[PDB]
Structures are given as structure tokens and as C-alpha cells.
Design a protein around this ligand. Structure first.
Ligand code: 630
Length: 280
């Protein structure tokens, strides 16, 4: 995967898909100059600018991320704005998907999603990328059978010598963060594992809100006292204990994504043994 540069004439915005501080995402059509083919795309138009060279170099890095469970950057357009042209995931974010189809989602799909997200997170770790924003809202659905992680700008590349990322002032998704990230602004692959654990909890509760109604400011205190998100109704204890492992104080006591791939793959071979869903 390489970074190609698009001219504004090459693509068209059709419809708004979402937005935030980062910018706005549109459903779009990309027609590579002279290729007479329509490619469905999601166009991310980002909100003192960096130099064009800096932006392209970062974009070259992003485009090199090539894994079945990470949403790929296909190209970039630099005009007055930065526009990132990404793969269009037909079924939207996974959070909305599980809420919408909760009556018709079985154990096989849930456990397969856990495997796939772990696989994508493991790939990012191999690339020395800490995500720092993993949550069901940031996983996308290619098909009910296939999901992809995406990134809205919080991810950081660790240099050869860096074992962690030390954050600055940016706003933080408190209820998804590891205790050490909240307390000391330290992020690692193992703090992504904590977030992976919360993400799994979201899936297993069909998109329920973590620490529902509790102010984010009280979260560090609750975690420091040893409280964690509750066992979801459909979860056998074996599955809940994996989640609980993701939330242990010592980051190095938490499983690594490679280990989570193995564990969930094992469960996914006998899904009804590990998740209990009526009519499944
Ligand atoms: C739960 C989070 C959410 O609703 N978001 C909306 C928006 C989506 O960004 C992308 N959307 C798609 N496909 C899509 C969306 N809706 N349908 C029906 C299909 N594909 C993408 N590929 C890359 C990105 Cl980014 C998107 C996000 O807003 C922040 C998350």
C-alpha cells in the first residue's frame, strides 16, 4: 500500500457520515483519473497549518498500514483543507450496529469481532503504533462478518527508543482509558489492551454505556478502589475473566493482543459454550 495524491476533480462528496473536533467524514465517490471506475470512499476533511511535506509524510505512514482489520487510507488531497480518502465501510460504526441489531446478533459474530479487533490491534503494535482511542465507536463494519479499526487522530508512532507515549494536553476518552493513562498521561500497547477490554464489554452488552451516568471525573477514584465494569448477562465467567485481565493495575500483567487473538479464537470455535444468547 502506497500513498497516492488525489486532485479535487477525482472525487466527490455525496453525504455526511459523521463529524467531530477532528473534522467531518463524508460518503463519497473516487474516480481515479483515467481509470473509468467508481470507487466508494469515506472522505475525512480535517479541521496554523503544517507544511504540505509534513502532512504527506505522515500520510505516507498511514497509507502503509495494510491489514484486513484496520481501515485503510487510500489517498490524500491537499488544498485549503486536508482531505483523507479512506475505505468506505458499508455498515457504519460497530457501536451503532450492535445497538441496532442486538435482537439478531449471535455468539459467533460477537466472538469473531473480538478476534478481528485483536488481530488489527496486534498489527498496529507490530507497527509500533499506539491507538489511544480504541472503543466500539471507532470500529467499523465492512460486513456483519468483518470489522475494521479506524483512527481519528489520537494514534501515535513510538520511536525506536520509546516504550510509551507521554501525552500532552489533548482531550481524553476517560471511560476507555487505563488508570496509568488517566493518572500520568502514559500510553502504551498495554493501555490499548485496557481499552480493548472496555470495547469488548461494549460489544457483550450490545452497546451499553460504561460506568453509565457516572461523571468521568470520578472514574480514576472508582478504579483505584478496585471496581470494574460488571459481568455482562450473556458472558460466561471465562469471557468476563479475560476482560478483567485487561483491567489489571499492572500493565504488564495484562494479556497482549497476540494472546487475546489465541484465547478468543479458541472460544470462537465453540461460541455457545462461552456466550449465552437466547435463540442462538
Ligand atoms: C459509532 C460512530 C459513528 O457513528 N461514526 C460515524 C462516522 C463514520 O465514518 C465512517 N463511516 C463509514 N461508513 C458508514 C457510515 N454510516 N454508514 C451507513 C456507513 N466508513 C468509514 N470509513 C472510514 C471512516 Cl472514518 C468511516 C464516524 O464519525 C466520527 C464514526
Amino acid at each position: 500500500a502506497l500513498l497516492r495524491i488525489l486532485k479535487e476533480t477525482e472525487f466527490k462528496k455525496i453525504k455526511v457520515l459523521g463529524s467531530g473536533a477532528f473534522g467531518t467524514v463524508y460518503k463519497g465517490l473516487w474516480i481515479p483519473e483515467g481509470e473509468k471506475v467508481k470507487i466508494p470512499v469515506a472522505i475525512k476533511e480535517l479541521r496554523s497549518p503544517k507544511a504540505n511535506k509534513e502532512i504527506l509524510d505522515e500520510a505516507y505512514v498511514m497509507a502503509s498500514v495494510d491489514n484486513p482489520h484496520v481501515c485503510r487510507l487510500l489517498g490524500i488531497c491537499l488544498t485549503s483543507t486536508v482531505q483523507l480518502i479512506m475505505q468506505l465501510m458499508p455498515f457504519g460504526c460497530l457501536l451503532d450496529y450492535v445497538r441496532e441489531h442486538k435482537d439478531n446478533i449471535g455468539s459467533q459474530y460477537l466472538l469473531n469481532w473480538c478476534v478481528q479487533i485483536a488481530k488489527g490491534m496486534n498489527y498496529l503494535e507490530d507497527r509500533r503504533l499506539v491507538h489511544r482511542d480504541l472503543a466500539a465507536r471507532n470500529v467499523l463494519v465492512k460486513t456483519p462478518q468483518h470489522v475494521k479499526i479506524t483512527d481519528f487522530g489520537r494514534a501515535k508512532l513510538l520511536g525506536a527508543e520509546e516504550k510509551e507515549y507521554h501525552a500532552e494536553g489533548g482531550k481524553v476518552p476517560i471511560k476507555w482509558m487505563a488508570l496509568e493513562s488517566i493518572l500520568h498521561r502514559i500510553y502504551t500497547h498495554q493501555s490499548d489492551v485496557w481499552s480493548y477490554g472496555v470495547t469488548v464489554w461494549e460489544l457483550m452488552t450490545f452497546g451499553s454505556k460504561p460506568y453509565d451516568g457516572i461523571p468521568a471525573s470520578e472514574i480514576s477514584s472508582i478504579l483505584e478502589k478496585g471496581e470494574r465494569l460488571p459481568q455482562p448477562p450473556i458472558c460466561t465467567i471465562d469471557v468476563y475473566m479475560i476482560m478483567r485481565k485487561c483491567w489489571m493495575i499492572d500493565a504488564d500483567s495484562r494479556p497482549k493482543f497476540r494472546e487475546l487473538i489465541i484465547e478468543f479464537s479458541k472460544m470462537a470455535r465453540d461460541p455457545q459454550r462461552y456466550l449465552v444468547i437466547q435463540g442462538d
